[PDB]
Design a protein around this ligand. Structure first.
Ligand SMILES: Fc1ccc(NC2CCOCC2)nc1
Ligand SMILES: [Zn+2]
Ligand SMILES: [Zn+2]
Length: 582
């Protein structure tokens, strides 16, 4: 309690000393309360007019249009302590997993220089507005780094003053850029040096890209075993136990010198003890603490989520295989059986999984996995939309498994080569491309965001008739040389001014390890679509009157957007499609 968080609390107390009141009508049951103080403020979703003008048929589809319009009672729940058998399974598994992840990697500190390059090329690092405007300005000023230095030396002393979370099934915990630096310095190596790559972790997919995930799931499907399981956890971040946070900290056992002490302090002072500020309407700022749950930077959150998910799923596999009999207590010889399973088959069992933070697919040895629920439930990783003790539904076909919000099709080219392509309901793809975040967008910046979605569709979703047509229309309506942009950046090969056919060939043919024949494709007409009925099943409007009129009259829509943008240099991309080619 207060010896580790007090200083941070003490400090905030004084910045609002003409406001501090121990409110008595405070809602928190599971968050420890400390006090309140005066504040007054809230960024909703804006429409991208370039994408909307070129997707007119979707103006009357509520699944698209409702996406642009508009539980914090899950953060305020608690998770019971796991039993001694569960705690032992996790500690053995975590010890073993860090060693395996560390065999071909060296933990190291990330640098001011690396941090500065990050901010000067924009990533969602989750900082705040104060003393400096943007992140870009604070990183150039030496005052900031003196602030960073004071905290840095405070952390080496086992103490914390300024590392405080700000809240805003989603809950995002912003910190000041300084606290974000110190987290990146100590733990950025997990992401920067690709600890969760598939090559390094066997279960992981970090840095893969949507064009690889289907091939990875098809490779898991080739293993002998049972159904493919893809259980979602109900609110994963809220189910992270203090025992989980202590198993994650064991990465520090692999460190040395300064780095070890700096990493130990992030885990002790900011992860295993937290201070948060929350906006209440009744409008005060509440200063609450708790020891458990996930509240880190989103990039460190991804790697530690992947780690603890890999651990949980290996333990569920051990349970299905009868490695241990009960979670109440491991015998002395059960401990040696678990250790020996890990050493003997651990790497094979990791290769049976695809894990992306809280998202997993597992192809276990057999279907005993389906009813192996005691460890999973007792670790607190309770499955979503199924009754606590009901067996998991198994998927018989890798093409029907959900993963990273997608499913995957096998698509055969006219020349016999096999593509495994990513897919999701087309209403979701169109509805997302019609949304922008934040204020002060010029027409040119709105156009370049539309172009980013269009190029993503040409590379990932070329097999959907409506998206290849709409992508060609947007790229025809935006000036040819204008550069695609985003405000929150997986691999993003569509973010380029290179010819999209050249990028398609590099991604799907040249650099694709599942494609033996490297013959380049010479035109978009060589590049296939889903079957017409499969395209409709996944949300295509082909066969509707609205869609036929849109496709026939597309040059009129393109010219409407060109007239709004004005006299600029444009290319007509529609003749790359058979139907507009004379
Ligand atoms: F590009 C296309 C693709 C399909 C289509 N219509 C067909 C959809 C399936 O039932 C027969 C008609 N029109 C244009
Ligand atoms: Zn601190
Ligand atoms: Zn599909």
């Amino acid at each position: 309690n207060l010896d580790i968080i007090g200083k941070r609390i003490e400090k905030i107390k004084q910045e609002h000393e003409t406001s501090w009141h121990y409110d008595q009508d405070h809602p928190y049951k599971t968050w420890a309360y400390h006090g309140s103080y005066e504040t007054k403020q809230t960024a909703s979703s804006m429409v991208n007019g370039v994408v909307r003008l070129l997707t007119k048929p979707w103006d009357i589809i509520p699944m698209v249009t409702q996406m642009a319009m508009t539980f914090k009672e899950k953060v305020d729940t608690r998770t019971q302590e796991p039993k001694e058998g569960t705690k032992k399974l996790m500690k053995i598994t975590a010890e073993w997993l860090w060693k395996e992840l560390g065999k071909k990697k060296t933990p190291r500190m990330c640098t001011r220089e690396e941090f500065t390059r990050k901010v000067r090329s924009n990533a969602a690092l989750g900082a705040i507005f104060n003393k400096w405007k943007s992140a870009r300005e604070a990183v150039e000023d030496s005052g900031f780094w003196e602030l960073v230095d004071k905290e840095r030396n405070l952390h080496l002393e086992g103490k914390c003053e300024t590392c405080v979370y700000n809240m805003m099934s989603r809950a995002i915990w912003y910190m000041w850029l300084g606290a974000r630096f110190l987290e990146f310095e100590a733990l950025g190596f997990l992401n920067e040096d690709h600890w969760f790559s598939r090559e390094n972790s066997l279960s992981g997919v970090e840095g893969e890209g949507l064009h690889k995930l289907g091939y990875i799931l098809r490779d898991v499907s080739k293993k002998e075993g049972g159904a493919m399981y893809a259980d979602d956890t109900a609110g994963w971040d809220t189910r992270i136990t203090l025992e989980d946070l202590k198993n994650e900290e064991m990465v520090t056992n692999h460190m040395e010198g300064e780095h070890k002490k700096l990493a130990e302090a992030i885990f002790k002072l900011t992860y295993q003890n937290k201070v948060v500020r929350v906006q209440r309407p009744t409008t005060v700022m509440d200063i609450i603490s708790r020891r458990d749950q996930r509240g880190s930077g989103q990039v460190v959150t991804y790697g530690l989520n992947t780690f603890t998910n890999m651990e949980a799923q290996l333990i569920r596999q051990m349970e299905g295989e009868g490695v241990f009999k009960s979670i109440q207590h491991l015998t002395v010889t059960e401990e040696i059986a678990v250790k020996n399973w890990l050493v003997r088959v651990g790497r094979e069992r990791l290769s049976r999984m695809a894990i992306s933070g809280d998202d997993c697919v597992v192809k276990p040895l057999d279907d005993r996995f389906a009813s192996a629920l005691t460890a999973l439930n007792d670790m607190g990783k309770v499955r979503k939309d199924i009754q606590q003790w009901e067996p998991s539904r198994g998927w018989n076909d890798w093409t029907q498994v959900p993963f990273c919000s997608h499913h995957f099709h096998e698509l055969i080219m006219k020349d016999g080569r096999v593509l495994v392509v990513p897919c999701r309901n087309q209403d979701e793809l169109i509805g997302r491309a019609r949304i922008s975040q934040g204020a002060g967008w010029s027409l040119r910046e709105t156009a370049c965001l539309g172009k980013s979605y269009a190029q993503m569709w040409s590379l990932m979703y070329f097999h959907r008739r409506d998206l290849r047509l709409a992508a060609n229309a947007i790229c025809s309506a935006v000036p040819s040389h204008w550069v695609p942009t985003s405000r929150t950046t997986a691999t993003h090969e569509w973010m380029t001014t290179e010819d999209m056919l050249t990028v398609w060939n590099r991604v799907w043919i040249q650099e694709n390890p599942w494609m033996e024949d490297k013959t380049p494709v010479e035109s978009w007409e060589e590049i296939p679509y889903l079957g017409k009925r499969e395209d409709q099943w996944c949300g295509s409007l082909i066969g509707l009157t609205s869609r036929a009129t849109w496709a026939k009259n597309i040059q009129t829509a393109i010219n409407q957007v060109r007239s709004l943008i004005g006299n600029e240099e444009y290319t007509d991309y529609m003749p790359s499609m058979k139907r507009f080619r004379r």
